Amino acid sequence: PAVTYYRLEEVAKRNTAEETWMVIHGRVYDITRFLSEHPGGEEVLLEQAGADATESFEDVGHSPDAREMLKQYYIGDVHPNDLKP
């Protein structure tokens, strides 16, 4: 298997609108092209760019179709040494 791994400090650098990455349940998503398409707006995503956004994502109560959309933006897994307990 060719799984690509990123450290959290690499993800932390894509925190602006020119290249926007986010972590959700331990996977890294490049959502740069989705910013303007997101139904909840681009601001709530930029506030969380470069970070683990799992709790906000789940707190909103996203639909099954929103979960499906993730797959388009998947680029890699968070290195296991950087995942918290």
Ligand code: HEM
């Ligand atoms: C990058 C992965 C994300 C995707 C693919 C995504 C997708 C969507 C989609 C499709 C909707 C429409 C309603 C639904 O189907 O549930 C939506 C609504 C919304 N999203 Fe996201 N979202 C993402 C991340 C986030 C994050 C990190 C936040 C921050 C808290 C957020 C906040 C919201 C809000 C507030 C709404 C409006 C809720 C409603 O009234 O429908 N989303 N999102």
